[PDB]
Amino acid sequence: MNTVPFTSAPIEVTIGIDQYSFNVKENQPFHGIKDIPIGHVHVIHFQHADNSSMRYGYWFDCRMGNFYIQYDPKDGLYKMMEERDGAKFENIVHNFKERQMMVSYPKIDEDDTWYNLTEFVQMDKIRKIVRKDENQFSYVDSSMTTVQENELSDPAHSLNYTVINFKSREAIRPGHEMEDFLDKSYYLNTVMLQGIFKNSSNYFGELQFAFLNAMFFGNYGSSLQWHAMIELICSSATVPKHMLDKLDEILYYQIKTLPEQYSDILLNERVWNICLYSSFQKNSLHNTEKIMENKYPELL
């Protein structure tokens, strides 16, 4: 179990760690989060109390280094940093634990929620979507735009998700216009899976990362990517059986985790009704359709 110590908490802030969150008061004796499960990526995220604008955060994997948080009073945010001095870090953490200055990652033993949300998400792929190669962790915030959003403005600060456009020469084979537009299997299986992602695990990893960014940061672009990747599968007549079964599980846990009161800002009526009720896969997502119909029947 790993630890992300905090130097201090000088401004009042709501701190998220994965699907959990807690309030820290201004100058409260808070010095970080312990007992973080090894084996998964994690995200630690922030919303300042005095300006809920700019929610932001950091994706990280404690196996890749020793990371801590320190508030920067010039740039006005909590920054993730790497400590290269291993013995310094271990000594810092131990003192904070002995003084019980850390909150515990509050994982219930029955609970696989975080695994199920991050099953295919890897740090190496996060770092290709979010380009800042001098750090081992990745910053994301509410305002960052995707490459697709910018085609339609600072490129160093973009989310490099795979572009998905249904009316694009990449999506549509000359001479198969109607075929490829009404059945997107060529685009899914040949262009995207065989060609760009190489395998379904990488595709699901980007889908899951886009959902998590959309939900934790209120990032609109990430929400568009997430919906686009779902629709591309549901709008394909030929999808491997194992991919459909896994997609149903992925979406089930995403819908299960969504705040009930954000379903207006995180769910696209058109995509979901199309996917569950009109698409080729309308009958292949039993778990997702049941939780959607019982939790968000208004949207449908």
Residues in the site for ligand UZ8, rule: CB under 6 A? 146, 148-149, 152, 164-165, 214, 218, 220-221, 223-225, 228, 265-266
The residue whose two tokens read 């033993």 is 109
The span of 19-27, 98-106, 165-173, 249-257 binding another protein (CB under 8 A) equals 165-173
Indicate which single residue of 53, 75, 133, 167 sits in contact with another protein (rule: CB under 8 A). 167
The residue among 192, 198, 199, 252 whose CA lies nearest residue 225 is 192
Q: With respect to another protein, which residue has the nearer C-beta, 177 or 269?
A: 177
Q: With respect to another protein, which residue has the nearer C-beta, 84 or 167?
A: 167
- Does 172 help bind another protein (rule: CB under 8 A)? yes
Indicate which single residue of 74, 84, 169, 241 sits in contact with another protein (rule: CB under 8 A). 169
Pair type for strands 20-24 and 67-72: unpaired
Q: With respect to another protein, which residue has the nearer C-beta, 169 or 242?
A: 169
The DSSP element (H or E) to which 71 belongs, if any, is: strand 67-72
C-alpha of 4 from chain center = 19
Number of residues forming the site for another protein (CB under 8 A): 7
Residues contacting residue 244 through CB under 8 Å, at least 6 positions apart:
233, 281, 284, 285
Beta bridge partners of 104: 34
Breaks (C-N over 2.5 A) in the chain follow: 152
Indicate which single residue of 85, 111, 112, 177 sits in contact with another protein (rule: CB under 8 A). 177
Q: Supply the minimum distance, in Å, between the C-beta of residue 224 and ligand UZ8.
A: 4
Contact 67, 137 (CB under 8 A): yes
What is the signed CA dihedral for 11, 12, 16, 17, rounded to 10 degrees?
Answer: 60
Indicate which single residue of 168, 194, 199, 283 sits in contact with another protein (rule: CB under 8 A). 168
Binding-site partner at residue 164 among ligand UZ8, another protein, none, CB < 5 to 8 Å by type: ligand UZ8
Residues contacting residue 68 through CB under 8 Å, at least 6 positions apart:
4, 5, 6, 7, 32, 80, 81, 83, 89, 92
Q: With respect to another protein, which residue has the nearer C-beta, 85 or 177?
A: 177
Contact 16, 45 (CB under 8 A): yes
- Does 186 help bind another protein (rule: CB under 8 A)? no
Q: With respect to ligand UZ8, which residue has the nearer C-beta, 168 or 199?
A: 168
How long a stretch of residues is the chain? 300
The span of 89-97, 134-142, 166-174, 254-262 binding another protein (CB under 8 A) equals 166-174
Q: What b-and-e string marks burial along 10-32, b requiring 16 or more CB atoms within 10 Å of the CB?
A: ebebebbbbeeeeebeeeeebbb
Binding-site partner at residue 178 among another protein, ligand UZ8, none, CB < 5 to 8 Å by type: another protein
Q: With respect to ligand UZ8, which residue has the nearer C-beta, 123 or 267?
A: 267
The span of 76-84, 170-178, 254-262, 288-296 binding another protein (CB under 8 A) equals 170-178
Beta bridge partners of 77: 72
Indicate which single residue of 178, 260, 261, 298 sits in contact with another protein (rule: CB under 8 A). 178
Within 10 angstroms of residue 116's Cβ, the number of other Cβ atoms is 16
Indicate which single residue of 181, 186, 220, 296 sits in contact with another protein (rule: CB under 8 A). 181
Q: Supply the minimum distance, in Å, between the C-beta of residue 148 and another protein.
A: 16
Per CB under 8 A, residues contacting another protein are: 167-169, 172, 177-178, 181
